[PDB]
Design an enzyme around this catalytic site. Structure first.
Site, PDB file in Angstrom:
ATOM      1  N   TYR B 122     -22.418 -95.200 -42.471  1.00  0.00           N
ATOM      2  CA  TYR B 122     -22.930 -95.471 -41.112  1.00  0.00           C
ATOM      3  C   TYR B 122     -21.711 -95.299 -40.072  1.00  0.00           C
ATOM      4  O   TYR B 122     -21.822 -95.091 -38.897  1.00  0.00           O
ATOM      5  CB  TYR B 122     -23.449 -96.913 -40.980  1.00  0.00           C
ATOM      6  CG  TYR B 122     -24.913 -97.099 -41.555  1.00  0.00           C
ATOM      7  CD1 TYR B 122     -25.733 -96.214 -41.062  1.00  0.00           C
ATOM      8  CD2 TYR B 122     -25.076 -97.953 -42.599  1.00  0.00           C
ATOM      9  CE1 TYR B 122     -26.930 -96.396 -41.628  1.00  0.00           C
ATOM     10  CE2 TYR B 122     -26.347 -97.949 -43.259  1.00  0.00           C
ATOM     11  CZ  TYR B 122     -27.332 -97.373 -42.602  1.00  0.00           C
ATOM     12  OH  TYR B 122     -28.730 -97.234 -43.136  1.00  0.00           O
ATOM     13  N   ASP B 237     -30.954 -95.192 -53.447  1.00  0.00           N
ATOM     14  CA  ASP B 237     -29.984 -96.310 -53.933  1.00  0.00           C
ATOM     15  C   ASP B 237     -30.753 -97.666 -53.755  1.00  0.00           C
ATOM     16  O   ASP B 237     -30.944 -98.638 -54.882  1.00  0.00           O
ATOM     17  CB  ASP B 237     -28.767 -96.437 -53.289  1.00  0.00           C
ATOM     18  CG  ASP B 237     -27.826 -95.337 -53.439  1.00  0.00           C
ATOM     19  OD1 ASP B 237     -28.152 -94.619 -54.686  1.00  0.00           O
ATOM     20  OD2 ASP B 237     -26.761 -95.113 -52.779  1.00  0.00           O
TER      21      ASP B 237
END
Ligand SMILES: [Fe+3]
Ligand SMILES: [Fe+3]
Ligand SMILES: [Fe+3]
Ligand SMILES: [Fe+3]
Ligand SMILES: [Hg+2]
Ligand SMILES: [Hg+2]
Ligand SMILES: [Hg+2]
Ligand SMILES: [Hg+2]
Ligand SMILES: [Hg+2]
Ligand SMILES: [Hg+2]
Ligand SMILES: [Hg+2]
Ligand SMILES: [Hg+2]
Ligand SMILES: [Hg+2]
Ligand SMILES: [Hg+2]
Ligand SMILES: [Hg+2]
Ligand SMILES: [Hg+2]
Ligand SMILES: [Hg+2]
Ligand SMILES: [Hg+2]
Ligand SMILES: [Hg+2]
Lengths: 340, 340
Positions: B122, B237
């Site tokens: 991010y 994930d």
């Protein structure tokens, strides 16, 4: 108290490494200390899969080894496995609750994670050289010769953790718990952290490296080569971990990150010196147990003690401590072929 | 009472997942529950480097993006960043001190580590699409709408941590701390851990997925392609993480692990249910803010609410809870394309 997300908007560039406001946002576009971001990047670039390294020929090499050499290799392997077990969990449990800058928080988790890969690496090696891995693993917890180290290491961590809990729960002051007075001092907590960090620094800088010489001696005689390849990858990681602890300690002692810590470190200087020498002595005493049934080619009690003193002088000087041993050049220059 | 290396030789195959003897040796040749070793292996195989993903084209898309669409994209991104910041550290600080089997200990550390990679992902995206990342990151902490949606997460973790500290420091019983009566019940601590786990399950399985839908809505428009590649890697994930929490919760419920936990799961079933209902509502209320300046074709408050109920029912059924919402078909089947 500790919080997983401090609701106060703060300038993460102005917080001390430890004991400041708990880290809220995990950002990596800026750092107070770029060294930690550089270490995270490097460590991520060094990720590796143990299972992919061929260690099939190690089983035969091992069985062919003289009984005393098997003892040397296995004893050393058990010790490395012990240290990795502790290092995989401890940095997180002990430091995470005290870190106040994001780059250091993530570095600690990345460092700890790499240690768990090392543990998985040793399981891979063990399963490929012995018939019953359980024999090896069980002997790690109870081995008297090995535990006369894990205890000292685990102690520094455990004491720091306990004092950290009291601090987060009760804060500073003189308190009472079930009829007993319990004193909580931030100054003492900071000292416990410094001592613990110095201890971990010696673990990363000396304890691991002494064991690497033991492993690469076999590699020099072209034996246990699978193990050797894995150890080279592990050693590459420890070099990064050592760089990290050295920077943490140097930043804490200089007074630029926290004046109080610099004051505390100067005060417990003799204690850190003794702590470091004690670790070197423990590594020395191991040589005896290690080479009791005899030594091997390229490695013996004498050479090992020489290397411990050589390495120790370097590491202690790196964190501002006096040199405890007479200066000398590397006793085993050949080790350089395997180390960063 | 917590130790980084318990000196008691114990059979790690017979320890309960939580509250047993702290893990000493980190071994991976065997396990009480192989599902955690399988999860570790899979997560390690999914390792990725965010910065490698080119997002230069994303900057152009974002800037040329209609204002209200920038608001939707950025708001969603900031919430995701908040959750990753929390998930990168919390599993370690809150769960590590309580785990008693090696496979689970390492899985939690591996799970948490992957979340830090998500956080770095991010930063990579944010830093590349906006001129001043500090505006985004700082707003994450102060944004009342964002903290409103995430309310309850950090609180649960923090409570579990404090109670855990009291347990390790004082042990079971009724104590007197600074003149106050403090009760430490292992049973209650177990309940707190169980509820914290159900909460994390809801976070991993619902909160993250609702955000993925918002991200992929742009991918459907052939916009923010770089972000899309990353979100697909992250989603991959999260699927492992929720598989892990669902297994932890269901194993505890089965009674095959700690018998007391089976009793507890049953006793607090209404609490588990309430947690999900609350979380679902939070995800819904967020719609008002997200679409305050307008919505997009295929992405609006009604669609978001329909998706929240859709996924919540699926997740609650996976852990044996009754369904709070009316059953229905996937309101956004186009999302399947981007997931798995
Ligand atoms: Fe290591
Ligand atoms: Fe290390
Ligand atoms: Fe994540
Ligand atoms: Fe996750
Ligand atoms: Hg320590
Ligand atoms: Hg330490
Ligand atoms: Hg050796
Ligand atoms: Hg050695
Ligand atoms: Hg010191
Ligand atoms: Hg020291
Ligand atoms: Hg020596
Ligand atoms: Hg010597
Ligand atoms: Hg929680
Ligand atoms: Hg939790
Ligand atoms: Hg959405
Ligand atoms: Hg309950
Ligand atoms: Hg519950
Ligand atoms: Hg439940
Ligand atoms: Hg709805």
């Amino acid at each position: 108290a500790y919080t997983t997300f401090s609701q106060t908007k703060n300038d993460q560039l102005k917080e001390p490494m430890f004991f400041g406001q708990p880290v809220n946002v995990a950002r990596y576009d800026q750092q107070k200390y770029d060294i930690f971001e550089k270490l995270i990047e490097k460590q991520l670039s060094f990720f590796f899969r143990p299972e992919e390294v061929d260690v099939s020929r190690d089983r035969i090499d091992y069985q062919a080894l003289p009984e005393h050499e098997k003892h040397i290799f296995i004893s050393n392997l058990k010790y490395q496995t012990l240290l990795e077990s502790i290092q995989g969990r401890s940095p997180n449990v002990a430091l995470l609750p005290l870190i106040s800058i994001p780059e250091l928080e993530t570095w600690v988790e990345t460092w700890a994670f790499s240690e768990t890969i090392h543990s998985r690496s040793y399981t891979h090696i063990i399963r490929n050289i012995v018939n019953d891995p359980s024999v090896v693993f069980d002997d790690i917890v109870t081995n008297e010769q090995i535990q006369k180290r894990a205890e000292g290491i685990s102690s520094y961590y455990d004491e720091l953790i306990e004092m950290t809990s009291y601090w987060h729960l009760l804060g500073e002051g003189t308190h009472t718990v079930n009829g007993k007075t319990v004193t909580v001092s931030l100054r003492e907590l900071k000292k416990k952290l410094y001592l613990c960090l110095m201890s971990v620094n010696a673990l990363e800088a000396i304890r691991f490296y002494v064991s690497f010489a033991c492993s690469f001696a076999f590699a020099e005689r072209e034996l246990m080569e699978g193990n050797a390849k894995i150890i080279r990858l592990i050693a590459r990681d420890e070099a990064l971990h050592l760089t990290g602890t050295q920077h943490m300690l140097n930043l804490l002692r200089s007074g630029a990150d926290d004046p109080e810590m610099a004051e505390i470190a100067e005060e417990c200087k003799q204690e850190c010196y003794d702590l470091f020498v004690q670790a070197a002595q423990q590594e020395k005493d191991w040589a005896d147990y290690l080479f009791r049934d005899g030594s091997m080619i390229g490695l013996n009690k004498d050479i090992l003690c020489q290397y411990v003193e050589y390495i120790t002088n370097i590491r202690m000087q790196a964190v501002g401590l006096d040199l405890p041993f007479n200066t000398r050049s590397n006793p085993i220059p050949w080790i350089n072929t395997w180390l960063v």
